Amino acid sequence: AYRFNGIGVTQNVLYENQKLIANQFNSAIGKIQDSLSSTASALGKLQDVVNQNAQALNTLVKQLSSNFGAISSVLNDILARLDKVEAEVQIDRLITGRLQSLQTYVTQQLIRAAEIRASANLAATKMSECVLGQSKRVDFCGKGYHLMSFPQSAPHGVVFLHVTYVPAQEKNFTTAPAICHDGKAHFPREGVFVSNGTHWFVTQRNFYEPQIITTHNTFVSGNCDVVIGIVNNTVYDPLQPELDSF
């Protein structure tokens, strides 16, 4: 009730639809298994991480079998195949070759590990806003108005489940920015003036729920000669009838 109340819908939407809402979410988890049960490309991002790191080592290891300009590729070979004074010139070519092959591997890690420090810092931010509370940053926690989330572990990573609220069947209606009763304008306290064509109503902006234009849900300012789109209509008052009841 107090997480709907954070995305502009009242609490009465929840309880008056509690049994339906539970089923909508319970069945939602039903499908999320199948998006992972057989489809394997869902976990693309992590699986791409492991390949790249194991790609480096193999490229690093095979470098140990290159002449680099020397006459062989095994130190024990060249050590047991030439005297002391002439081996240094050959061995030099190997060392400078392998140094270059090792720096180049380290530099990648220095860079690549800095593209993941920018991923954890983006996860630690979501886990502190999406999970530990409700976030209103549009399209940060989900796609639609955000409700809640659930962390789930994974090998070298983390998986979220952004529960989200999304509207449905939309009905077009005639509007008016204001309503003039006795010259005085009338603005909605919170809502949009709406009409089916017959009678006028005021509703919240995210769930059709008509109400009568009473003086409680309305507040006035000035006379109706300066706004555009002003319409003529009555404004019901509830403080009159109980007086007449006497």
């Binding site: 909508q24 988890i29 998986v159």
Partner: protein
């Protein structure tokens, strides 16, 4: 181009032997290297099909040795369907190929989704009447695999006659073994930052009364 009476060997930008005169006569010629480009193979799943198309990059189709010259190159082995669908294997400049129905590789222009207008009016409002709670996933990397490499063994295969030479190069090893250790410590810090935001461990009660919401 015009050469003063004492000019050949026009470098003409940086170092390239561009337009040059000749012996036996006096003619100001020009030089341009022969056409070059990098071929690339666009193929669907190997199990799905063995037919492949070839994209010669950045060359006129008239110098290749059912072609369709695109802004990227000279694609050979695909039919230009006017039809517009979603991209499957991006080529470039707005051409995306795919394996569609017999069965072959086609190529076309990308379609940036569908099209519609909106019924905007001076006094018209739209209000939804229902909702669909939905569940999505986003899947974030957190840490690499903590690794390390001792230099003086990878470089010198346990040869003292090699370690003696390696010492002369200064402190190259110390730098690498410091950088990789820093990386590993950072990985531990990473994995501790994301999850350890709660000070103290909880647990659900043995009974479950959440209002109809199954978290089984």
């Amino acid at each position: 181009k015009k050469f003063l009476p004492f000019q050949q060997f026009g470098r003409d930008i940086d170092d390239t032997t561009d337009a040059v005169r000749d012996p036996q006569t006096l003619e100001i010629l020009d030089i341009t290297p022969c056409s070059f480009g990098g071929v690339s193979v666009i193929t669907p799943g190997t199990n799905t099909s063995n037919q492949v198309a070839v994209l010669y990059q950045g060359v006129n189709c008239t110098e290749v040795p059912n072609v369709f010259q695109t802004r990227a190159g000279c694609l050979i082995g695909a039919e230009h369907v006017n039809n517009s669908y979603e991209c499957d294997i991006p080529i470039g400049a707005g051409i995306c190929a795919s394996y569609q129905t017999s069965q072959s590789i086609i190529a076309y222009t990308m379609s940036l989704g569908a099209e519609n207008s909106v019924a905007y009016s001076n006094n018209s409002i739209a209000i939804p009447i229902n909702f669909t709670i939905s569940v999505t996933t986003e899947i974030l990397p957190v840490s690499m695999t903590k690794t390390s490499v001792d230099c003086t063994m990878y470089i010198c295969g346990d040869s003292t006659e090699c370690s003696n030479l390696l010492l002369q190069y200064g402190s190259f090893c110390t730098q690498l073994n410091r950088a990789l250790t820093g990386i590993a410590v950072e990985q531990d810090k990473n994995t501790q930052e994301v999850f350890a935001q709660v000070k103290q461990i909880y647990k659900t009660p043995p009974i479950k009364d959440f209002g109809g919401f199954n978290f089984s």
